[PDB]
Design a protein around this nucleic acid. Structure first.
Lengths: 43, 185, 144, 37, 60
RNA sequence: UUCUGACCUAUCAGCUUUUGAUGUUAGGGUAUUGGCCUAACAUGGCUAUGACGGGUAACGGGGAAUUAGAGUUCGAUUCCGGAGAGGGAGCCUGAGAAAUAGCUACCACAUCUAAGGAAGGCAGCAGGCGCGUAAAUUACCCAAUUCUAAAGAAGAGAGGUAGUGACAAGAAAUAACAAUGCAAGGUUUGUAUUGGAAUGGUGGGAAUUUAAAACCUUCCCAGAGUAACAAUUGGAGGGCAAGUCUGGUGCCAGCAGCCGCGGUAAUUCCAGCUCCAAUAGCGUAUAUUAAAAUUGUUGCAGUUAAAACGCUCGUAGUUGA
């Protein structure tokens, strides 16, 4: 029945770890770098 | 009782957020002026808008009206004190002529970069932030400090800084000195 | 001409006509009639504490086919039974037999939401623990 | 519906018939009121 | 000192004689300069012992 | 005590008048005018401009929010004025109180009792219980601000100072720079490898500040390379800015203000990856303003979309060669 069926998919899926992540820029630095990546050669 | 000091919000939000062309124009302003937040643009814009609203109210009010001519002379005099209006601009229609870049140029980081004390707007911002600038013998930590007309050439390094000609004294510099001293001893 | 009275002394007509005709606005009626303070089980609160009576699986409105797992809750505050939604598929499974729920509104000011049929409330914290944290798993651990 | 009568677009059953059903129903209800009082 | 120092602003007072210092200066400021620490230190427990008395039953 | 000014309600239209309603006269009473109270005599008075009732999650104002201009919503909540001190009521004292850490009584509560009796009132400040969606310490001090006295020198949980505080509001980090490699431009500018310079926070000591302590500032010591001294929140079909990205589920599970996505190759679900928005803040609900010239004085609409009273006369109304 539907009471049994509930909660399937999240439990069902084969989860994968999120592994190695390098830290991002913040703030003015992040915005400036983004501005340069979008708009300099690529604008 | 409650504290009787006043307080006010720095800005007005620009609404309708995903106006791409407007958003990219703000990003160009961030890129140019060494700003950390859209809120920085919005506060300077809010100040400009307050000025623009005042200037509109004055110019809409009649010629030779006593409040208007007094407040108008006072406003223009203040624009002269700030240096926001310079030599060649001298009436309320030039206040309407004022623009958001002109206000942004008044920021201390822009002045520091312009004078060439630092190599970039960001380098200028950090130089100010590290308490290493001084304006007229006053040490200042605020990169958004809006200079007056006189004070623009009164900008030089903080006295007790390395760039002031005092001690660096840094953990690195001291560590090198200890290494040399231990080597010699 | 061909419209409302222009007359100087005609403010009385404009006020009475406006005053009477105002009532046909839906927002104005709900706000200015007593029904607000009466028919709403939340009685002007955003939030209410209740207890779960029953776990039910409601079938979706005609364009969709799907059973939405919901909870019939009795508010402690005013002693009123309501049906409330529970977001998160396994969180209903986690939730207990007579769980103590902090239930809220559903983003629509007492109007119906999506394909849910008259279910106007949603549970956002259970046994003082956060629903989002229960859904996450990186965020705060389940209750004892 | 609104206060205004009929207005058959696509609509449903006849307005006059709906009206007949309600007039007959109101009488039936009036008989229930009579039973009561 | 104020921000960035190199300056210190304060306030000074110079009295005519020692009698003037006694006469027209505040006790904490006299202590801060140099004088004995404050008498009768107890907060509202003083009040509590005080309010109990009925018409010379005892002084204490 | 004069004048002027109210939210909603007619499925509230006649109210008030033997029990003073409205007037007159005479007295009494009052601190004084006064139906304030008594007697005698009149029969009035108020009412669509909505009286009289009923509702209000209704203390009033200065004001607050949003305001292009109108407006609309809101105003326990730092000031001014009112009201109240468990419920009602009554006094005393005194110039001033119908006081309330004055008194008396009743009802609603309730404490100690030696069982006769006796005493109690946080909507003062803490703190606790209950209510709840929801809100802090039984801290220290009278140094300032002021108040009261036999008024300097004393008192004051008035008041100040801390503590708890992501209610809001402001400022403001999370790098900067030179080398190389790459990129574009043919010997220039821009940006992913490296490695030397600059620095707060953080830890300690002072000068100082203070009722005292703490914070501020200032100085002296210390003191980052994964600068682990670790940026989050929500998105990427459309509305609406960024992926027909990689796997899983398979009209199920589920998500998603709305449209929708899901029946095996999912651009919406569950993960992972990249990208995007705002940023020490961002989600969520509820209420509210804009949005709404969608309540319309400005400024709406009524042939066919919602809406011209069946028709005419007509008093109030509004308009007036």
């Amino acid at each position: 029945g539907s009471l049994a069926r509930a909660g399937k998919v999240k439990n069902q899926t084969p989860k994968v770890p999120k592994l190695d992540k390098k830290k991002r820029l913040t703030g003015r630095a992040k915005k400036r770098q983004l501005y340069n990546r979008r708009f300099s050669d690529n604008g | 009782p409650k504290s009787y000091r006043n307080y006010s919000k720095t800005a007005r939000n620009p609404k309708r957020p995903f106006e791409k062309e407007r958003l990219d124009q703000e990003l160009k302003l961030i890129g140019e002026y060494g700003l950390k937040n859209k809120r920085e643009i919005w506060r300077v814009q809010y100040l400009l808008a307050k000025i623009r609203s005042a200037a509109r109210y004055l110019l809409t009010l009649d010629e030779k009206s006593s409040k208007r001519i007094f407040q108008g002379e006072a406003l223009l005099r203040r624009m002269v004190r700030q240096g926001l209006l310079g030599e060649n601009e001298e009436k309320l229609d030039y206040v309407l002529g004022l623009t958001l870049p002109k206000l942004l140029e008044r920021r201390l980081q822009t002045k520091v970069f312009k004078l060439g004390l630092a190599k970039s707007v960001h380098h200028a911002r950090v130089l100010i932030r590290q308490r290493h600038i001084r304006v007229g013998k006053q040490m200042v930590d605020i990169p958004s400090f809006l200079v007056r007309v006189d004070s623009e050439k009164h900008i030089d390094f903080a006295t007790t800084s390395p760039f002031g000609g005092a001690r660096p004294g840094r953990v690195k510099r001291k560590s090198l000195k200890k290494q040399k001293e231990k080597t010699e001893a | 001409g061909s419209g409302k009275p222009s007359g100087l002394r005609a403010a009385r007509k404009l006020r009475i006509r406006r005053r009477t005709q105002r009532w046909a606005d839906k927002s104005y009626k709900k706000s200015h009639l007593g029904t607000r303070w009466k028919s709403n089980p939340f009685r002007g609160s955003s939030h209410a504490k209740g207890i779960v009576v029953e776990k039910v699986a409601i079938e979706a409105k005609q364009p969709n086919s799907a059973y939405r797992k919901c909870v019939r809750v009795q508010l402690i505050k005013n002693g009123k039974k309501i049906t409330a939604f529970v977001p998160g598929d396994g969180c209903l499974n986690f939730i207990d037999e007579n769980d103590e729920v902090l239930v809220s509104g559903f983003g629509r000011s007492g109007h119906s939401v999506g394909d849910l049929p008259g279910v106007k409330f949603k549970v956002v914290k259970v046994a003082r623990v956060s629903l989002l944290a229960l859904f996450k798993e990186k965020k705060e651990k389940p209750r004892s | 519906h609104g206060a205004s009568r009929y207005k058959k677009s696509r609509a449903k059953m006849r307005w006059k018939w709906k009206k007949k059903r309600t007039r007959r129903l109101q009488k039936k209800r009036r008989k229930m009121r009579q039973r009561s009082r | 000192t104020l921000f960035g120092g190199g300056r210190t602003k304060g306030f000074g007072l110079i009295y005519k004689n020692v009698d003037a210092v006694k006469k027209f200066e505040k006790k904490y400021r006299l202590v801060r300069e140099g004088l004995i620490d404050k008498e009768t230190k107890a907060g509202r427990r003083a009040s509590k012992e005080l309010k109990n008395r009925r018409k010379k039953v005892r002084g204490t």
